[PDB]
Symmetry: D2
Subunit: 118 residues, 4 copies
């Protein structure tokens, strides 16, 4: 259900595998920001969700360090998978950048991403 | 610096190992919410941080299912590791429940946790 | 043209008046949660925005108490007015409920609402 | 008990009076950021909170423009007042900047402020 290739509205690409385990491993590619190429991601999801039509809860993290670049920052996404004719993953995310502590008040960005199968 | 046992203001236990590749592995134990004993965590962090006194960006995830129970939910922490007088990890987090499409507007909580080694 | 009647994706109604001194006044009606009928709102906005195509920052608050019910909660919306063809207000919101000390960790929901005039 | 002068962990000064209609009005002076002097704030609070000892739900907004500068931003604070000897106002905030559509994804900062007397 979750395993496969997913696209968000910014055009980043998300490529995951869900292990029978509860694990999320894959790579991420961002259309925007101080990013170039694919980054390692990792996460967890509910491998035994409710069968009432409720969504499947999950999350993952990306640190923006790869051989190409280091933005000194990390994003985590927290959301739920929703199956159907139009499967979706609706998410909210937090992007934190390393700042000195005098500038810590401005270290974190928030937003939302929606990923679809097409 | 990062690897070790951390406690937050809530009394939760964050047992983390920082692998040289930027991986975070370990185990989380919450003293609040619909949870008991240890849950698997995974995450990532900036393995080559900045030297200007800036802190170290990181993030991780817990999906709240183990051998004893399943809350059908997931939490992600995003924040930064700061050295100094005493070590600390400052985070903001997002916690999403699996819900129906109708209840999704109230699926996600937000907070901030401060982890220290005491 | 912030002044006017808007709706979001839940079907709630946002009726506003934007002052020349930079004030926002009006009523809010929600289609979901612990609410019925109209509620007072108040906010501020940038009265002298940038003319470089940037949107106009604004924000407002609703305390969910009127003559018919009281949910012991307040929602603040923070976002911007996008002028043009399809005028929209894009927001992110924080909904805080009054809680006991026990429950403060779970006091605050985060989400996002999109308002249009259609 | 919300009325008066409050300071947060950043050294900023919040001067506010709470109206009997659940109105919040006053002044904010930020110790940090693209700011100088005072700014008008306005917001709302639960004027009949739960008598179980729950905190008092509130929020306010500051747009960062005065006669000295205009930062083209607005912050909203959402939180609860908690009375008693260590009275506090515990908040989470959203700081949104005017952006072009291409940079909307990074328009909004999130933080937390604890105000104390
Ligand atoms: O630090 C950087 O600028 C790189 C971060 C990548 C941009 C973000 S992560 C949240 C949002 N969703 C995306 O697909 N891209 C942006
Ligand atoms: O669904 C549940 O109730 C279990 C989630 C655990 C509660 C949270 S996660 C954020 C915060 N930090 C903690 O240590 N515990 C709570
Ligand atoms: O349930 C409450 O505590 C009061 C009603 C809250 C309604 C919320 S505010 C965010 C979202 N957008 C809406 O139009 N309604 C909900
Ligand atoms: O830089 C700007 O855009 C205007 C100043 C913003 C200051 C912020 S608002 C949240 C936080 N709390 C404070 O007291 N100051 C900062």
């Amino acid at each position: 259900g979750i395993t496969g290739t997913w696209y968000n509205q910014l055009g980043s690409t998300f490529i995951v595998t869900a292990g029978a385990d509860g694990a999320l491993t894959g790579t991420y590619e961002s259309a925007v920001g101080n990013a170039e190429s694919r980054y390692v991601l990792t996460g967890r999801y509910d491998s035994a969700p409710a069968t009432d039509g409720s969504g499947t809860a999950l999350g993952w993290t990306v640190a923006w360090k790869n051989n190409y670049r280091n933005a000194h920052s990390a994003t985590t996404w927290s959301g739920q998978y929703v199956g159907g004719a139009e499967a979706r993953i609706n998410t909210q995310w937090l992007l934190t950048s390393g700042t000195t502590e005098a500038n810590a008040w401005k270290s974190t960005l928030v937003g939302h991403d929606t990923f679809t199968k097409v």
